[PDB]
Amino acid sequence: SADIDECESSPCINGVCKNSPGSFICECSSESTLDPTKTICIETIKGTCWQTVIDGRCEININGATLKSQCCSSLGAAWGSPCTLCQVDPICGKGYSRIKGTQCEDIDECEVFPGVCKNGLCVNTRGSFKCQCPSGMTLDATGRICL
Ligand SMILES: [Ca+2]
Ligand SMILES: [Ca+2]
């Protein structure tokens, strides 16, 4: 006989899975709390979304008040203080956050990072976003600057 390792299926939404005999356990960090089913960490505390990681620290606060799942599944390199490195949802991937089951929902990057478009209008799209330039202007290579 062997125990099933349920953690292989990434059952713990926004949490860490710990296998156990006959079951599994989801653990939440201090910015979240378990739902009734004990498989989803519901975000309770916002924190800083960092655009970069350098040496042993995180830099460039792009928004001081983001949901970790929103930050980390889109434009953030890291989140919080002290910070931890962002990983996209293993099921939904970049641009989306996992809500329940394998259900993914679009992240609005224009809300995660107000000002992501340096001199244009941020326009959210499903799975990404784009910068809309003033009339007569076009985007640079990075897509964030209008010229
Ligand atoms: Ca198990
Ligand atoms: Ca989006």
Numbering used by the authors: 1 to 147
What do the authors report?
Crystals were grown in the presence of 20 mM CaCl2 in order to saturate the N-terminal cbEGF9 Ca2+ binding site, which is likely to have a relatively low affinity for Ca2+ based on previous work (McGettrick et al., 2000; Smallridge et al., 1999, 2003). The overall shape of cbEGF9-hyb2-cbEGF10 resembled the tetragonal pyramidal shape previously seen in the fibrillin-1 cbEGF22-TB4-cbEGF23 structure (Lee et al., 2004), with slightly smaller dimensions of approximately 6.5 × 3.5 × 2.5 nm. Like the TB4 fragment, extensive interdomain contacts were observed between cbEGF9 and hyb2, and between hyb2 and cbEGF10. As expected, both of the cbEGF domains in the structure were found to contain bound Ca2+. In cbEGF9, Ca2+ was coordinated by three side-chain oxygens (Asp807, Glu810, and Asn823), three main-chain carbonyls (Ile808, Ser824, and Ser827), and a single water molecule. We show that these highly disulphide-bonded domains are structurally related to both the TB and EGF domains, as suggested by previous sequence data (Corson et al., 1993; Pereira et al., 1993), with an N-terminal region containing a hydrophobic core consisting of a conserved tryptophan as in the TB domains (Lee et al., 2004; Yuan et al., 1997), and the C-terminal region containing a disulphide-stabilized β sheet similar to some EGF domains (Knott et al., 1996).
Fibrillins are the major components of the extracellular 10–12 nm diameter microfibrils, which mediate a variety of cell-matrix interactions. The molecular organization of the fibrillins, and the related LTBPs, is dominated by calcium-binding epidermal growth factor-like (cbEGF) domains. Related domains, the hybrid (hyb) domains, which have sequences similar to both the TB and cbEGF domains, are found near the N termini of these molecules, with two being found in each of the fibrillins (Corson et al., 2004; Pereira et al., 1993; Zhang et al., 1994), and one in each of the LTBPs (Gibson et al., 1995; Giltay et al., 1997; Kanzaki et al., 1990; Yin et al., 1995).
